[PDB]
Every structure is written in structure tokens, then in C-alpha cells.
């Protein structure tokens, strides 16, 4: 069995083992990696997104496994494309983060598993400082990738 | 900020520049005024203070030039007054302006520091001098330079 907490901890330390029994779990319960219960109820963060924050050397293969699991249930598209919902990071996707981190490899990977390239990150974190701040590029992956000189 | 920085210049200007011009001005005015009192027998321009006040007007812009008739050897009195004006009204007043121009150039960055200091002292005191009433007591600065 797996609750939200269980996976998020596994992800935090790049553990691909504690997620050995993962796929077969939501096969029995037919639960989806995308269920309401597998996201933070106030931000909309998913395990893939936790993984995106918990990088070590711009690397995490909990990602590769996490994606793999989502296709086997074909949560695939809406999984890789889930966005933040809090006023701060609203509309931020994993692809936004990969770029923010200047990580070709993870941009490449996300685009190949079908990240929406037109997804607008539009929360207060992506507009001019309250100061909050900060910082605006606006919104769309291309725009980001240019404004950060990439 | 605009007015406060300006006030610093007035204070800076006053003591050093104004103070320096004042000494020489008192010295010149005193000497010449004494020379004049000796010169005049009668008519109330004899009194040192009275002559001195008449001598001051030259500096104000109200100088009378030949204020008093009742002096002897008249050409000398005029010579005394012309010399006082040349060295003292023109040479000094115009000099004071140039020297003021100097204090101003040197100060301004310094006078911004002084203004900054003055706000700090006023603020620090009110909180201490504000009863040390409940008040804040984390600093961070929003930053964004690349450098990336």
C-alpha cells in the first residue's frame, strides 16, 4: 500500500526501490497517480513535481519510473501536465521547472513523454514582485527559455 | 530628501565658510571704522558704533559712500572709503561666493551621508525615545542580478 506521504518521501531521496511495489498497487485498487488524493490539496503538487523540486545533481530517476508508471495506466498525459493551483505558482508544470533549472535532459524527457509546450505558468510567482516577488518572463516555456537566455 | 540634504549644506556652509568670512570682515570693518572715527570731529559719526554701522551698509548693498561732511582733509576720507570698498565689499563678497562654491562641490556626497545619518539618529531616538514601545524586534533584500 501507498499514501501520498509514502511516495513523496521516496521521491525526496531518489529511491527507485520503495516504488518497486508501486505499479501493482494502483492496479489492484485501480487508483491513479493523478487522483485528488495523490496531490497536495492546496497547491496541486504531484510526485513528479516533488521529484522536480528534489533534484540532486540535476537528476532523479524517480521521474523516469514515475512517468513509466503513468503510461502503464496511461495517466500519462494529464500526469506530465498537471499544474499548480495556489495563487503563487499557479499553472506551473514540470516542464516549467526543468527549464527554470536549465536542464536540457529533463526538458527533453518531459517533451518526449508529452509535456504541453504551451502551458502558461501565470501565478504571482511569474509576474512582477509585490515584492513577492518575482519574476516575469511571461508564462510560456519558449518565453521562459528566451528570457533566461537559454 | 531634497530639502533635508539642502539643510545640511546650509549648516556646513555656515560654520566653516561663513565663520571664516566673518572674522576677516570683522577685522577689516573694525579697522577702517576706527580709522574713520579718528577722522571725524563731530556730528554723531564720531561714535565708533555709529561710524561702524555706516561702514557696514557698504557690505549690505546700502553703502552711502560719502555719508558725512564734517571731516577734514576730505580727499583722505574718500580714499579710506574707496579702499575699504575695494578690498572688503567687492573682493570679499565675490570671494565668499567662490569659496561657497567650493564647500558645495566637496560636500554634496558628504552632505548626503550627513543627511542619511540624521534620519537614522532621529529614527533611532524615537523608538528608544518612543518609550521603547513594542516595535519590530529577519532581514533579506529582494534581489535580481544576472550574472546568469
From Swiss-Prot, chain A:
Impact after mutating residue 6 to A: Abolishes phosphorylation by PKCM and enhances channel response to capsaicin by PKCM
Taxonomy, superkingdom: Eukaryota
Places the protein is found: Postsynaptic cell membrane; Cell projection, Dendritic spine membrane; Cell membrane
Effect of residue 45 to A: Abolishes ATP binding. Abolishes CALM binding. Impairs normal desensitization by repeated exposure to capsaicin
ANK repeat residue intervals: 1-28, 43-75, 93-118
Binding site for ATP: 5, 45, 50, 54, 89-92, 100-101
Residues that bear Phosphothreonine: 34
Positions of post-translational Phosphoserine modification: 6
Tissue expression per record: Predominantly expressed in trigeminal and dorsal root sensory ganglia. Expressed also in hippocampus, cortex, cerebellum, olfactory bulb, mesencephalon and hindbrain. High expression in the cell bodies and dendrites of neurons in the hippocampus and in the cortex. In the brain detected also in astrocytes and pericytes (at protein level). Isoform 1 and isoform 3 are expressed in brain and peripheral blood mononuclear cells.
Outcome (variant: residue 89 to A): Strongly reduces affinity for ATP
Processing and modification events after translation: Phosphorylation by PKA reverses capsaicin-induced dephosphorylation at multiple sites, probably including Ser-6 as a major phosphorylation site. Phosphorylation by CAMKII seems to regulate binding to vanilloids. Phosphorylated and modulated by PRKCE, PRKCM and probably PRKCZ. Dephosphorylation by calcineurin seems to lead to receptor desensitization and phosphorylation by CAMKII recovers activity.
Further details from the record: Responses evoked by capsaicin, but not by low pH and heat, can be antagonized by capsazepine.
Subunit structure: Homotetramer. Interacts with PIRT. May also form a heteromeric channel with TRPV3. Interacts with CALM, PRKCM and CSK. Interacts with PRKCG and NTRK1, probably by forming a trimeric complex. Interacts with the Scolopendra mutilans RhTx toxin. Interacts with the spider Tau-theraphotoxin-Hs1a. Interacts with TMEM100. Interacts with PACS2.
Family per similarity comment: Belongs to the transient receptor (TC 1.A.4) family. TrpV subfamily. TRPV1 sub-subfamily.
Function comment: Non-selective calcium permeant cation channel involved in detection of noxious chemical and thermal stimuli. Seems to mediate proton influx and may be involved in intracellular acidosis in nociceptive neurons. Involved in mediation of inflammatory pain and hyperalgesia. Sensitized by a phosphatidylinositol second messenger system activated by receptor tyrosine kinases, which involves PKC isozymes and PCL. Activation by vanilloids, like capsaicin, and temperatures higher than 42 degrees Celsius.
Recorded domain comment: The association domain (AD) is necessary for self-association.
Protein name, entry field: Transient receptor potential cation channel subfamily V member 1
Organism: Rattus norvegicus (Rat)
Residue numbers of the full-length protein present here: 111 to 260 of 838
Amino acid at each position: 500500500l501507498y499514501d501520498r506521504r509514502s511516495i513523496f518521501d521516496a521521491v525526496a531521496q531518489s529511491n527507485c526501490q520503495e516504488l518497486e511495489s508501486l505499479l501493482p498497487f494502483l492496479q489492484r485498487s485501480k487508483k491513479r497517480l493523478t487522483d485528488s488524493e495523490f496531490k497536495d490539496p492546496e497547491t496541486g503538487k504531484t510526485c513528479l513535481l516533488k521529484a522536480m523540486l528534489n533534484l540532486h545533481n540535476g537528476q532523479n530517476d524517480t521521474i523516469a519510473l514515475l512517468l513509466d508508471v503513468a503510461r502503464k495506466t496511461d495517466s500519462l498525459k494529464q500526469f506530465v501536465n498537471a499544474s499548480y493551483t495556489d495563487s503563487y505558482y499557479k499553472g506551473q508544470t514540470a516542464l516549467h521547472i526543468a527549464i527554470e533549472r536549465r536542464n536540457m535532459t529533463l526538458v527533453t524527457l518531459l517533451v518526449e513523454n508529452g509535456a504541453d509546450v504551451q502551458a502558461a505558468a501565470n501565478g504571482d510567482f511569474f509576474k512582477k514582485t509585490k515584492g513577492r516577488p518575482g519574476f516575469y518572463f511571461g508564462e510560456l516555456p519558449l518565453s521562459l527559455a528566451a528570457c533566461t537566455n537559454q | 530628501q531634497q530639502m533635508g540634504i539642502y539643510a545640511v549644506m546650509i549648516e556646513k556652509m555656515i560654520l566653516r565658510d561663513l565663520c571664516r568670512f566673518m572674522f576677516v570682515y570683522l577685522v577689516f570693518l573694525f579697522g577702517f571704522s576706527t580709522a574713520v572715527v579718528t577722522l571725524i570731529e563731530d556730528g554723531k559719526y564720531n561714535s565708533l558704533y555709529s561710524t561702524c554701522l555706516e561702514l557696514f551698509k557698504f557690505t549690505i548693498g546700502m553703502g552711502d559712500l560719502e555719508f558725512t561732511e564734517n571731516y577734514d582733509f576730505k580727499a583722505v576720507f574718500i580714499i579710506l572709503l574707496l579702499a575699504y570698498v575695494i578690498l572688503t565689499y567687492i573682493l570679499l563678497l565675490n570671494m565668499l561666493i567662490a569659496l561657497m562654491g567650493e564647500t558645495v562641490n566637496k560636500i554634496a556626497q558628504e552632505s548626503k551621508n550627513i543627511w542619511k545619518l540624521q534620519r537614522a539618529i532621529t529614527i533611532l531616538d524615537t523608538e528608544k525615545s518612543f518609550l521603547k514601545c513594542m516595535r519590530k524586534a529577519x532581514x533579506x533584500x529582494x534581489x535580481x542580478x544576472x550574472x546568469x
